[PDB]
Design a protein around this ligand. Sequence first.
Ligand code: HEM
Ligand SMILES: [O-]
Length: 153
Amino acid sequence: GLSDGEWQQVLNVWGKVEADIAGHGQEVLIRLFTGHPETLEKFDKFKHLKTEAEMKASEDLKKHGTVVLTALGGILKKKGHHEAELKPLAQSHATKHKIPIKYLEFISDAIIHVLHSKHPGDFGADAQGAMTKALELFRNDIAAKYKELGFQG
Ligand code: HEM
Ligand SMILES: [O-]
């Protein structure tokens, strides 16, 4: 797990995201979709976004970005005691949305990239280490639920 010091770093970094949840959410999803087009296909409502300009101009994409980061933020604030919050998310993503765990790795990487992109020089090595541990814990706990369901893709 993460140490108290690491969780404090995670939540300090998260404060940066909370100042502009929509902007961060939008950029994380655009980073995901442009770097891994196959992920866009999992969203029937975003499949029409044929270009990054259309992605940038989509208010519904920003809306979903807000939903995604709000959910992740809720989980992070639990500092690992997130079973009740994480289980339903893991189950909807495996059973309803059919999201392979690889795509969760992709979005975790996108979050780290967006943090550096929006806060260059202000997302330190310690902060990156802590946030990475938090995202890995998140991903790994979802993976355990995916294994329970026998879900691969
Ligand atoms: C940080 C990771 C993620 C978080 C916190 C997150 C959170 C959410 C939430 C809260 C919802 C709405 C409630 C629900 O259906 O469970 C949702 C819906 C959805 N998610 Fe995610 N998600 C994550 C990653 C992904 C990834 C990586 C994909 C696909 C590559 C994905 C695909 C979907 C789809 C298709 C929906 C339904 C969208 C719609 O048509 O309204 N999610 N997600
Ligand atoms: O999502």
